[PDB]
Amino acid sequence: KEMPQPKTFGELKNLPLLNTDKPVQALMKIADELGEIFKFEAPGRVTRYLSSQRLIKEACDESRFDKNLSQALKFVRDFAGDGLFTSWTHEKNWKKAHNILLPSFSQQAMKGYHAMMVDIAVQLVQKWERLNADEHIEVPEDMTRLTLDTIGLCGFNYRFNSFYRDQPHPFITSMVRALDEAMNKLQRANPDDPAYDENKRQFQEDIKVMNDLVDKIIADRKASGEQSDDLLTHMLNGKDPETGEPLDDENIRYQIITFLIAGHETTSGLLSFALYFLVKNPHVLQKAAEEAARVLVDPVPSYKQVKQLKYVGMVLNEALRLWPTFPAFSLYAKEDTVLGGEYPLEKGDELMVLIPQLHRDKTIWGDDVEEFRPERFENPSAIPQHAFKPFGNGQRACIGQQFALHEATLVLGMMLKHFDFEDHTNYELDIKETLTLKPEGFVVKAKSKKIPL
Amino acid sequence: KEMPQPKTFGELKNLPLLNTDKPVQALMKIADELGEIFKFEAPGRVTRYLSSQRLIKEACDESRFDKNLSQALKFVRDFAGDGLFTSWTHEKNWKKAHNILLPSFSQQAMKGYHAMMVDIAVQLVQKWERLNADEHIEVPEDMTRLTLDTIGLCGFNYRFNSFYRDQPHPFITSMVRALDEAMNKLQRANPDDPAYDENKRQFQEDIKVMNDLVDKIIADRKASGEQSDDLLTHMLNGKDPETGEPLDDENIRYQIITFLIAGHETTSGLLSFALYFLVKNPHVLQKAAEEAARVLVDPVPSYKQVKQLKYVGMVLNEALRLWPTFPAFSLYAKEDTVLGGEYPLEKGDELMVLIPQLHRDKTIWGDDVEEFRPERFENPSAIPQHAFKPFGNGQRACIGQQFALHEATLVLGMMLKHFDFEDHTNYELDIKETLTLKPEGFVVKAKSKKIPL
Numbered sequence A, B: 001k002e003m004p005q006p007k008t009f010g011e012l013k014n015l016p017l018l019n020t021d022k023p024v025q026a027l028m029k030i031a032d033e034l035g036e037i038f039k040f041e042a043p044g045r046v047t048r049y050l051s052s053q054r055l056i057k058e059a060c061d062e063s064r065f066d067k068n069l070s071q072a073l074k075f076v077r078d079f080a081g082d083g084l085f086t087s088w089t090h091e092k093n094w095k096k097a098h099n100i101l102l103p104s105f106s107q108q109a110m111k112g113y114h115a116m117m118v119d120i121a122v123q124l125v126q127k128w129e130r131l132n133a134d135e136h137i138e139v140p141e142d143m144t145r146l147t148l149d150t151i152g153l154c155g156f157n158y159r160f161n162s163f164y165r166d167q168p169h170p171f172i173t174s175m176v177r178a179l180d181e182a183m184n185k186l187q188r189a190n191p192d193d194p195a196y197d198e199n200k201r202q203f204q205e206d207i208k209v210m211n212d213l214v215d216k217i218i219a220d221r222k223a224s225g226e227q228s229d230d231l232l233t234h235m236l237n238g239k240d241p242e243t244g245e246p247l248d249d250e251n252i253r254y255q256i257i258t259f260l261i262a263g264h265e266t267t268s269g270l271l272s273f274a275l276y277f278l279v280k281n282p283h284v285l286q287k288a289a290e291e292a293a294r295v296l297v298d299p300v301p302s303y304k305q306v307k308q309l310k311y312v313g314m315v316l317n318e319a320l321r322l323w324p325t326f327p328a329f330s331l332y333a334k335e336d337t338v339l340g341g342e343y344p345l346e347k348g349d350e351l352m353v354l355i356p357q358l359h360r361d362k363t364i365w366g367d368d369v370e371e372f373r374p375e376r377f378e379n380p381s382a383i384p385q386h387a388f389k390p391f392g393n394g395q396r397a398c399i400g401q402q403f404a405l406h407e408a409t410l411v412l413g414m415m416l417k418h419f420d421f422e423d424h425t426n427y428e429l430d431i432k433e434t435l436t437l438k439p440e441g442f443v444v445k446a447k448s449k450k451i452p453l
């Protein structure tokens, strides 16, 4: 159709547009200007950004499109390896690990993780109970402490003890710096230029630090013989029904690194955005707090009680609507095909699904798309197909969805039961972009309702 | 016959002997060489160090000798003011505060503080329970986190939240640096030399940090009118029966600063030395652990149970015997008098009581003074008057004695109930001197007995 394309910079084509610390937000504005589809070129490379439910519903057809590793994911793959998130669907270790780990991530398995989630959630509540009169909370910082700890504990019985520290754990320093370097590689003609030798040296170091530390966690567990009901145990013992094979220790390492990435990056952002919207929308906070008080009648919340926090669940979905914390996923055409009746694609052609824009499609949600209204999610059946994709699509959808939502619902429920919140700075949303999105500098004050634990 | 005296440095006399990281330990070595008394001279001053029970019992006759402010304490007074610890006996505010505060520090008052002591103690135990299998504990660091927080919470319902951070609370950074400066001023021949301009700027800044926080806490409490179970409440409401006056806000601040200093410095040291002696003497550890397990039958220890920890109390007293954490106190002759039928003293003459040396007086304790044997304290009746003085003397004895011993007995009891301990490094005692003595670099491993809290 003579596809729309944003401004170009001679031989660099569109690449300079991503030379910014907020590339996703830049892409969202481009989508606002250009519409449901735009081409994005750089030297030697092209992708097409999709923003409408009309086109994205075709992109979600697994017979036509499969998951692609974006350039960022190809760089994350240098340390996340062939774990689930950075593997191609056709790689043997993808379907093997997928089949082995699904049972570990089901709604049923959440019952088993619940106690350990409560352990970390209570540490959060206690921290906040123990703050003095005039003190405030650094929201994304504390949400990250929580979610990292939760996956460490539930994942491999390891306590990061984030609420005991200011300094991040050695693994995290390397992980964050690796993630940063992976995103920075996306703006470099001549990667072999000696000006990046220190960047490369640091990256290799960081890779080796994560490996050495995770490999030791594996080794120690094999050595102890302990059978704690966690992801590491299920990976050590599990066999893929198809091949009959277990995961090898290298792949297990990559899965653990992957889970730590997820638990540090994604769920913490969700909790941070949810709290942000609640303090910006007092009527919604009140309704959520009402439910929390009504449902969480015991000092320790139970698994069943978390399932009964329906409005808290809707609040989280609405937070995921506006700011899906992993904001884009990539696809490639399995064969030649035509998108939307108008855009012919060849086998191998790539697409990027711009999730925050999909979630702002006024044809789907109505004109009030920027408003925070959890009630939009009262009935999944009234939401059109492929309109809401915060956890991606199909067989390559987020394996951690049930875990993330259970943790987030539990913690947000507890938070709303135990405290009233003040937006004491009238915080202005400022979204930092790493692998994920987070509200940087978001702070609040929390006044205890003095309900015992 | 002339009074013994250590080596001299020309015009500086004995002063350079205290130009060392470990002055008290240097003075103990000198005492060992020279005996029960030696003179120590510096430019413009003289003092006499006493090591024997026979001379010290006379020095402790309050009709003949009163508390002196050592050079060190005069410098500490720049921030502790006319608080109890740094006031002269004849100053109006000493007796006034003493009368008001004595009931707040009694054995009976410990019933009121017990619950908040437990609050912090449980945080210590949770921290250690949450360590990963082969991580270790930094003993004085964690004991200092505990004792500071306990006196903060019991003293003025303020949470330093030391177990939530690596870097000390700003107030503590200032207090430590002020205490360090106060000790450092002692060696400067020309204090107004421009080389100390920064030291003095920093000292004043540190004093202001301390005054600001404390004055604010006092102001906030008076504004709100709330009534807590803390020393601050008692000081705001208390009246001295003698003068009929309450303490004013400035003196209240000095008392609070004083209590914070004491909690940070002294009790933490006692706990660290006790654990040191315990891991070096496993028979004693076993005997103390048996008592802890037998007595502390509830997840939350009670006041009544802490009082039953007789042997844990003996352990603490024997640790105080070998390493009394505030190791020296100073006296002055009220009038002309003769010490020991041998050494004439003029009115105003200063004496220093070397407590560690008193506690090694073989004429009182037997020849095995260096051995750690809590059974020495099996029957308190046996201990001669003035043989054991870790809490000083008479009306100027430590007002916090019952507080310190309650906290230490509680915490050590809980530690011995909940963990086994390993001296994994075969630690060599290395004693750091600030205001007090503490074992620097003492580390252990603690293996949980998995007893619920």
Ligand code: HEM
Binding pocket: A067, A084, A085, A086, A098, A151, A258, A259, A262, A263, A266, A267, A270, A324, A325, A326, A329, A330, A389, A390, A391, A392, A393, A395, A396, A397, A398, A399, A400, A401, A403, A404
């Ligand atoms: C609010 C929280 C989370 C969000 C928004 C989120 C989002 C996503 C999205 C959008 C994808 C698809 C990526 C793509 O198509 O390239 C994905 C994949 C994945 N997520 Fe998450 N995620 C979250 C939490 C978690 C957690 C807690 C874990 C693990 C403990 C996890 C593990 C994974 C894995 C392993 C994949 C790859 C699955 C596969 O392809 O087989 N996620 N996630």
Ligand code: HEM
Binding pocket: B067, B084, B085, B086, B098, B151, B258, B259, B260, B262, B263, B266, B267, B270, B324, B325, B326, B329, B330, B390, B391, B392, B393, B395, B396, B397, B398, B399, B400, B401, B403, B404
């Ligand atoms: C094991 C712990 C402790 C030891 C070994 C200890 C030792 C001492 C000693 C030896 C003195 C006499 C000082 C002198 O003669 O110049 C003293 C005085 C004092 N201590 Fe402690 N102390 C401890 C804990 C505490 C605590 C926890 C507090 C307060 C919370 C405290 C508050 C004081 C005060 C206010 C004085 C001055 C008393 C007065 O002269 O009226 N001490 N301490």
Ligand SMILES: O=C(O)[C@H](Cc1c[nH]c2ccccc12)NC(=O)C(F)(F)C(F)(F)C(F)(F)C(F)(F)C(F)(F)C(F)(F)F
Binding pocket: A015, A018, A023, A024, A027, A040, A041, A042, A043, A045, A046, A047, A070, A071, A072, A073, A186, A326, A327, A328, A329, A352, A434, A435, A436
């Ligand atoms: O890594 C990629 O392949 C694509 C597109 C791209 C990056 N460089 C290009 C050069 C030519 C053509 C396309 C590109 N990168 C992006 O869209 C982006 F801007 F970096 C991005 F939006 F931040 C992102 F990386 F895709 C993303 F949205 F943040 C993400 F994929 F969700 C993330 F995983 F978070 F990185």
